[PDB]
Design a protein around this ligand. Structure first.
Ligand SMILES: NC(=O)c1ccc[n+]([C@@H]2O[C@H](COP(=O)([O-])OP(=O)(O)OC[C@H]3O[C@@H](n4cnc5c(N)ncnc54)[C@H](OP(=O)(O)O)[C@@H]3O)[C@@H](O)[C@H]2O)c1
Ligand SMILES: NC(=O)c1ccc[n+]([C@@H]2O[C@H](COP(=O)([O-])OP(=O)(O)OC[C@H]3O[C@@H](n4cnc5c(N)ncnc54)[C@H](OP(=O)(O)O)[C@@H]3O)[C@@H](O)[C@H]2O)c1
Ligand SMILES: NC(=O)c1ccc[n+]([C@@H]2O[C@H](COP(=O)([O-])OP(=O)(O)OC[C@H]3O[C@@H](n4cnc5c(N)ncnc54)[C@H](OP(=O)(O)O)[C@@H]3O)[C@@H](O)[C@H]2O)c1
Ligand SMILES: NC(=O)c1ccc[n+]([C@@H]2O[C@H](COP(=O)([O-])OP(=O)(O)OC[C@H]3O[C@@H](n4cnc5c(N)ncnc54)[C@H](OP(=O)(O)O)[C@@H]3O)[C@@H](O)[C@H]2O)c1
Lengths: 256, 247, 256, 247
């Protein structure tokens, strides 16, 4: 009952963290806009989650919107107002992570990662915030960043600046949207077992080395992020804006 | 619904932030141990809260336990097991903030500040963690630090190291207690409630209002619940945007 | 002295922080590639600094390289090698901060800021790291970020993520370029009195109010960054990589 | 030379980082006051460094000053002005790190840890800062903290809050001493080596080598010099990239 009758837009919600965060939002009474990339795989996943959300009495719609396309922000807002009447929460989750070495990093891979992880998020946040301010009823914006926003990654010279930039956008947006009662925060997931980690997880030796680094003793699951996202979108966090929240099982603080 | 059949110990729960957290924890279904300094004001406030919690169907006791006395942790843990038979959550909230200039800080005031704010919290955490481990069912530990754990204060040279010290403790203990399923986190409140000075402080909060003690209940109950089962070693600002608002 | 027999590239060295840093490295015995954007004003300033560096026996050349142009980084390294034989230090300083509100941010303004401050830096850092690894004698890279990498600004929703992304790029590049003896760090200046913020300093009430928030009791000057920048590029910082350093007179910690 | 005519006090300056920093300041023209713990070996090391400093033309004195004894701050200051007529820089390096598990952490072990690392540093800083204000010619203060001021350590639950608090102490003192031209900053060294496990620890450092005391003398002399005239309330990691290299 934390988001009853609220409209929640979750970009990249056909798989992994976004999918489980869109489910728990409908379980908290929200009508969810299930944004996806527009591919035929993301359409299969977004419509699969919709079947599951309606299965427990929820209500949700699938919207195709490539994050790299800067028009996608207004496309999601329009389809959310038209189906449910408002936009109350934006969970910005869409992003890529193509691991690659720095010195031979192709230019087009860098811009593709920046355009998708940061550029599209900016104007997706702007279009959602514009609707929130017009309504005058406040709102919440949560950006799924990463632990990599505080530390480095050798194969991620193109990826971590977009996660660190995503965190810094919530800080400056909190000051700008504060006078309109719009809260902007970021969750920093640690090591979550998801579709990006398929090849690395099957190796048992690497997985034990990854698990050994986490004080809680296990890798993360998409459901582990759903709670803190519903929390940051709720009245329980009514005085929380411009903040970050690690969800990593203690990974960041466990210096070897 | 979030804390059914859990035993929560809140130190300094007679006034301010700890009082509002203890009340909310009781609403969530928890058996709460209300801790106070043992003074007349602390004992009176602990009673009044136990009266209100009992009136709406809660379960709570009131235990006096000076945070500076390093024995209080085991005293509150013994009082908790004796009444409810478990210890599952600890909210270390007790603390003082006596403003004072730096170049003339007397040893007495500093040692009382570090002794109340940090030294007592350490062994209060130690006591609660000892019971959680031997129980074998996990548990949560939340320390009420401050936004002053990330920045400084000229009249708080003796105070901000204890806040940042409390944050560091939650980082280390989360390592040493992760295998026993004991999560440790720190909440960082901002400015929680001269009218010309009151609005000048409000001018710097992007949300446009000072905090209230109930603004810390939600964040504390979230960290102590299954909503945060993968959240340990983290800090959470609860300040209305005060930290990011640079000018 | 500290930078003898060393070639330092300093982008955006015609004015402000870059001009002071390039002059100081030359005072420490280095041969400085003075980078500018190519404008007539920039070229005049780069030439003015070179003539000053020659006045006290130093050696420097002026090279135009539009940071918004992603081909400029390879042209900067080539000009340095051709004239001096090596690239040993890179001070990435070129950047802009066009103040603008968030909700009506034009697409051109955001993309111009991100492309200049972050995207151009990435490939200027790549081209310089490529030469340093090739030479086999290590190097140093210093990105001029900002205190805005740790906090926000309501009129800088597009600008602070490029500063936070520069810091994080240095963290990730420290790991990737560590085995080759290349140290990567970032300086976070506070409010330095330059042309990037001159309109706010044109007001006496605004200038004195900003000074009130600095514990050291004065706004920064460009030379206040030259010392810290030369320290990080020298053997003094032998064991310093992936770190940040505030040069703000205490502005960050002074909670209001 | 960057520290000519300046008087520098270095606590814990008989071994490790403090010894390397005290010698490096002497090579920069400073009159060094080599503080030590008063132990048998401590006085030997501090007196051997003063002859080594005098061997290359420097000027240094040795002063026994137990950091846990809060009287030490004014003892070093008075000994510095008696010997050199001034106090211009304070390098607070003295500290202990006794690794110990948390759930059976003795009370007296915690109290010695915090007392030496934080409380004793507090009043050493205060004693030096009052003399710097009395001279009215500015000053600089450097606190040797650690990477553990930002992360956790399961066997260092008593240790990391002391180092996180020393950072928080420089932040707040920066504000309180800014108006007097006193800069306060902290260095955060990584694994400073002062063989099966030594190989694995090196594999986590991007620079590919562990730390040595001299690796910290450059950062310290920089923060103490005019090259950092606008640097106060800052912290500098000197860890060869250990903090940023996750995994
Ligand atoms: N998994 C981890 O361990 C981890 C750790 C730290 C941070 N993160 C971040 O958290 C986010 C969620 O990751 P995950 O665990 O769910 O795995 P994931 O496979 O990376 O999911 C990311 C989602 O973004 C969508 N996507 C890719 N390109 C898109 C585009 N143009 N437009 C719209 N959506 C696009 C993806 O497909 P669809 O559009 O079809 O939904 C996907 O649903 C990611 O952005 C990731 O960077 C993940
Ligand atoms: N309010 C803010 O703006 C703010 C800002 C930053 C941090 N904080 C944190 O919030 C915590 C409580 O402050 P508050 O806002 O709630 O103000 P408050 O109304 O004065 O609350 C103080 C509480 O801590 C207890 N306390 C103080 N000294 C104690 C001692 N020796 N032994 C046992 N208990 C002691 C008190 O118990 P008794 O009732 O028995 O006296 C009291 O319940 C503190 O730990 C502080 O660090 C608050
Ligand atoms: N000043 C401050 O208070 C402050 C605070 C925080 C961070 N910073 C950072 O410090 C850096 C420099 O700031 P500043 O104070 O020196 O401002 P400034 O006085 O305006 O100088 C900016 C320099 O960057 C160059 N520039 C702008 N766009 C360029 C482009 N496409 N290509 C190449 N060069 C370009 C400029 O060269 P031209 O002469 O050719 O235009 C100029 O030399 C910036 O990255 C800024 O973000 C400054
Ligand atoms: N070793 C590392 O890798 C590392 C890493 C990060 C941080 N640190 C921190 O940085 C500091 C220096 O590192 P280190 O390895 O070089 O330490 P150390 O030399 O091995 O021993 C501590 C130094 O301070 C002195 N000391 C201990 N207790 C004292 C007391 N009451 N009063 C006065 N002096 C006392 C010691 O003896 P004397 O007084 O006789 O000289 C010694 O010079 C340490 O305090 C440590 O906390 C160390």
């Amino acid at each position: 009952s934390l988001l009853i009758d609220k409209t929640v837009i979750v970009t990249g919600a056909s798989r992994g963290i976004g999918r489980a965060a869109a489910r728990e939002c409908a379980r908290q009474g929200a009508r969810v806009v299930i944004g996806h990339s527009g591919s035929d795989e993301g359409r299969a996943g977004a419509l699969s989650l919709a079947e599951e959300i309606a299965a427990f009495g929820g209500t949700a719609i699938a919207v195709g919107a490539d994050a790299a396309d800067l028009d996608s922000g207004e496309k999601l807002v329009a389809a959310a107002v038209e189906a449910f009447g408002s936009v109350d929460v934006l969970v910005n989750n869409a992003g890529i992570c193509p691991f690659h070495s720095f010195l031979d990093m192709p230019r087009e891979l860098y811009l593709k990662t920046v355009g998708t992880n940061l550029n599209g998020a900016y104007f997706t946040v702007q279009a959602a915030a514009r609707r929130m301010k017009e309504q005058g009823r406040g709102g919440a914006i949560i950006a799924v960043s990463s632990i990599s926003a505080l530390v480095g990654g050798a194969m991620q010279t193109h990826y971590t600046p977009t996660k660190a930039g995503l965190l810094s956008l919530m800080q400056s947006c909190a000051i700008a949207l504060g006078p309109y009662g719009i809260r902007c925060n970021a969750v920093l997931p640690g090591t979550i077992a998801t579709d990006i980690n398929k090849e690395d997880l099957s190796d048992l030796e690497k997985r034990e080395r990854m698990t050994s680094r986490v004080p809680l003793g296990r890798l993360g699951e998409p459901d582990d992020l759903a709670g803190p996202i519903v929390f940051l979108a709720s009245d329980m966090a009514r005085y929380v804006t411009g903040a970050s929240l690690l969800v990593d099982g203690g990974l960041f603080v466990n210096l070897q």
